[PDB]
Every structure is written in structure tokens, then in C-alpha cells.
Amino acid sequence: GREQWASRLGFILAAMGSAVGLGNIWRFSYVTGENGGAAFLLVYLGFIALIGIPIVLAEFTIGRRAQSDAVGSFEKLAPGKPWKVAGLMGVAAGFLILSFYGVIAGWILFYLFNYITGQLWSAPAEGFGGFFEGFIANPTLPLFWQALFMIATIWIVAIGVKKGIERSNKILMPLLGVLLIALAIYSLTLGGAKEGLAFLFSPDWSALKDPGVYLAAISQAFFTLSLGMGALITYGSYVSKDSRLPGAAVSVAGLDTAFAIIAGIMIFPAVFALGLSPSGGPGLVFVVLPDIFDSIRLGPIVGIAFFILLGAAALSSAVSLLEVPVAYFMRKFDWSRKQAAITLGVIITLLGIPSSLSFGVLGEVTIIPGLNIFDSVDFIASSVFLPLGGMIIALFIGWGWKTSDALAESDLTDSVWGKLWILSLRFIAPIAILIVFLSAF
Numbered sequence: 001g002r003e004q005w006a007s008r009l010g011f012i013l014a015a016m017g018s019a020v021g022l023g024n025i026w027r028f029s030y031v032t033g034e035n036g037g038a039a040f041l042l043v044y045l046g047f048i049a050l051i052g053i054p055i056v057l058a059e060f061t062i063g064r065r066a067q068s069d070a071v072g073s074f075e076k077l078a079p080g081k082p083w084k085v086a087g088l089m090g091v092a093a094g095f096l097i098l099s100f101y102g103v104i105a106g107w108i109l110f111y112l113f114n115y116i117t118g119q120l121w122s123a124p125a126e127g128f129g130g131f132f133e134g135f136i137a138n139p140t141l142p143l144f145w146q147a148l149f150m151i152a153t154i155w156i157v158a159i160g161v162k163k164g165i166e167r168s169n170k171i172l173m174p175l176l177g178v179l180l181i182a183l184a185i186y187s188l189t190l191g192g193a194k195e196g197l198a199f200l201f202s203p204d205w206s207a208l209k210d211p212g213v214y215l216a217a218i219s220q221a222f223f224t225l226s227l228g229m230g231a232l233i234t235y236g237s238y239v240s241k242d243s244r245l246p247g248a249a250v251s252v253a254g255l256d257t258a259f260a261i262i263a264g265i266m267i268f269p270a271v272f273a274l275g276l277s278p279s280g281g282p283g284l285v286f287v288v289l290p291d292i293f294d295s296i297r298l299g300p301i302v303g304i305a306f307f308i309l310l311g312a313a314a315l316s317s318a319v320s321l322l323e324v325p326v327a328y329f330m331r332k333f334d335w336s337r338k339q340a341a342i343t344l345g346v347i348i349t350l351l352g353i354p355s356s357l358s359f360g361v362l363g364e365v366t367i368i369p370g371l372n373i374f375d376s377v378d379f380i381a382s383s384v385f386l387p388l389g390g391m392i393i394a395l396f397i398g399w400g401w402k403t404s405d406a407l408a409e410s411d412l413t414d415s416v417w418g419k420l421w422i423l424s425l426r427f428i429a430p431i432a433i434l435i436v437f438l439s440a441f
């Protein structure tokens, strides 16, 4: 008696709700800002089309065919084979990513609280940078705001696939999109549009000589798509026998890429208008956007609505993160859904506390040479586990299945896209990820 998405539209909304989150605005802004902008963008865009779309389809195909969790989908489709390592790494990557994801999601609830309590309406004397720096440097407060978010994340995954994840507000993600477009229009009028549009859309190939911008591009590509973390295999697992998988893949990435491009038109024109540097770091959007909201007469209302819609999309992305280990520990250890959700949830919360302290007391502590605790947990998950875990998934469909099985389960039997899709999984994606791995390291 295994669960499945009750409604018909629930699967694509859940996958979109998984993809559209903090990686589109927070991470995309500062990863693009410190990687040169336009040149990094085109490489990132080319990775999404060539590699992101096939892997999104590939993860959908594995889960729907096997109807099991992340690891058990490889045990059923290929028993006694080492392909399951991609499922193991994905479970670990979701564990690592969720730990610091809730921390950033704690920053959002804290800013939402301030707007709701009239704090951040006008500019504090320390400035929005000093207010942000002073808040992240505080040890206790972000832990408290990380906890509240994880509780809501735990609450939803414990309720179930049908009653919780499936039952979500359809309006919030378009509301967020409507709010981003309106904010993008306003940012063009601030005076830094030309400076920002040049940084964002005029390629400077000088920054392309470093092979690290490809690694950072493939990292943001897989992060924003929820790939390599067992999410889409799991959301594909609860899918009925008849459903259109290819169009879901293009809708997920197409909508997601639309949400990321608009986030660049809002941030970078606003960055240059304030005279800031695009390579500030993780707190780029937390120091820029409050500056921009304060320029608005009704900015407090804009800020309240902004951190509500963004917080809900971050809520749906973390729910898709927590669902992967819960699904594994349910089948493996016979844990109840509530027990697995609370246990893993509190565990991942404690694992994310070291990432939160790296912005304050633990700033000078590094694990990977030159990278603090937060940058090292992110780098291992995003830049190492996600591509390497995604390469094996591609090789799994390209060389572990017979072609008729892949095209049939992917519904690409009678189309030209099946030929280009198999080409990408067998050669394009695994070789390109390999070349990026060899070049960066």
C-alpha cells in the first residue's frame, strides 16, 4: 500500500514547488555576482539545456518506473549493481543541503518578523549591511529562526505526501513570480540598469579562463533544478502509470529558469544603483533588497509580501529535501512517517547549526582549505556530490537500460527528442561533467 499523488496536477506542482526556492534568488544572485555575470550565465544556461533537462527527465523516469525511494529505485531496476551509489550520494547530499538551507530560510523568517513588527521599515542606524552582518553574527537568533522553519518543514512531511506536500497553495508561486516581475520593472528605473544589464548580459570571456566558473555553473545548475539530491526520483516515485514526463521536465526547468532570470534583473541593477559590489557573498540579497524596499513609499508592504511568498517557496523546496531521507528510513528501518520526519528533522537541524555559526563565531574555522564550515558543506554537496551523483544517473539510463525501456518509460518512443535525450545521457552529460571535474581540480 504505497502512496501516490492524489490529484492529476499535483506532481508537476510538487516538482515545481521543489525546484523554485532559495536557489533562484539567494544563491543564483551571489554565485553569478562573484563569477562574472554574463559569461557565467551563458555557460550556466547551456548546462541547463544540455544536461539539466535530460537529468530531470532521467530522475523522473527512475522513480516512476521503480515506485520506490531514492536508493530502492536502483535496487529494483538493477539489483546487485553498483549504480545505487548515486542514490546513496543523493541521500547524503539532501542531508547536507537541508542543514544549511534551513539556516538561510531562517534569515527570511527573521526579516519577515522585522517587517511585521515594523523594525526594518526605515533604515537602522547601523545600516542594512550592519543590521544583516550583526544578525548573522549573533549565535542564538538564527538558530531560533532555523528551528521554526524546520518545524514547519517537519510538520508538512510528517502529515504525508497527499495531505501535506500535495495540498499546497497554488497561488503563492505565481504571486512570487508576479512580485518578481514588478520588482524587476522598478529596479530598471533606479539608475544602475545599464551598469547591471551590462554585467548581467554582456559576456566578458576574460573570467572564463578559470575552470572554476564551469564547476560553479554546473553546481548552480543542479542546485536550482533539485538534481543529484534524490528529490525528483522521489517525487517521480509517487506518480501514476500514465503521465507526461518529458513536458514536466521542460516545464520544471523552463519555469525555474524564468524565475532565475527575473531575479537577476531585480538584483544587479539595484546593486549598481547602491554602488555595491556583485561579489559581496551569500548576504547579497539580504543587504540589497531591503535598501530597495526602503526606496519604495509602500516598501514595508512590499517587504512583508516578499518574504512571505519567498518563504513559502523555500518551504516547499525544503519539504522536498526532507522527504528523501524520510522515504529511505521508512522503507529501510520501518520507521513511521512521523517518527522518520521528526528524528531526521531534528538531526538535520543540529547538523546545520555549525553552518550557522560560520557567519559569526566560527568564521575563522575552515574544513576545506580556504573555505569555512558553510562554504565547505555547500561545496561538498553542491560542487562534488551533485554532478558526480548526476553523472552516474546519466550513465545508468544510458548504459544500464536497453533503449526501448528508456524511451518507453520516458514517453519519448515516437519523437525526435528521444534521440537527442539518449545522446545527452550516454555521452554529452557524463563527458562534460567529467571534463568539468578534471579541469576544476
Ligand SMILES: CCCCCCCCCCCCO[C@@H]1O[C@H](CO)[C@@H](O[C@H]2O[C@H](CO)[C@@H](O)[C@H](O)[C@H]2O)[C@H](O)[C@H]1O
Pocket: 109, 110, 112, 113, 114, 116, 119, 141, 148
Ligand atoms: C512573523 C515572522 C514570520 C512568522 C513565523 C513566526 C511565528 C512565531 C512568532 C513567535 C516567535 C518569534 O520569536 C521572536 O524572535 C525575535 C528575534 O528575531 C525576538 O526578538 C528579539 O530580538 C529582536 C531582534 O530582531 C529584538 O528586536 C527584540 O526586542 C527581541 O525580543 C522576539 O522576542 C521573539 O518573539
Ligand SMILES: CCCCCCCCS[C@@H]1O[C@H](CO)[C@@H](O)[C@H](O)[C@H]1O
Pocket: 194, 197, 198, 201, 202
Ligand atoms: C531587459 C533586457 C536587457 C538587455 C540588456 C543587454 C546588454 C546590453 S550591454 C551594452 O553594451 C554596449 C557595449 O558593448 C553598450 O554600448 C550599451 O550601452 C550596453 O547596453
Ligand SMILES: CCCCCCCCS[C@@H]1O[C@H](CO)[C@@H](O)[C@H](O)[C@H]1O
Pocket: 201, 202, 203
Ligand atoms: C534569454 C537571454 C537573452 C540575453 C541577450 C543578451 C544580449 C547582449 S549581447 C552584447 O551586446 C552588446 C551590444 O548591446 C555587445 O557590445 C556585447 O559585446 C554583447 O555581448
Ligand SMILES: CC(C)C[C@H](N)C(=O)O
Pocket: 018, 019, 020, 021, 022, 023, 024, 097, 101, 223, 224, 225, 226, 229, 317, 318, 320, 321
Ligand atoms: C535544494 C533544492 C531543494 C533547492 C531548490 N531547487 C532551489 O532552487 O531553491
Ligand code: NA
Pocket: 019, 020, 021, 023, 024, 223, 224, 225, 226, 256
Ligand atoms: Na530553483
Ligand code: NA
Pocket: 016, 017, 018, 019, 020, 021, 022, 312, 313, 314, 315, 316, 317, 318
Ligand atoms: Na520551493
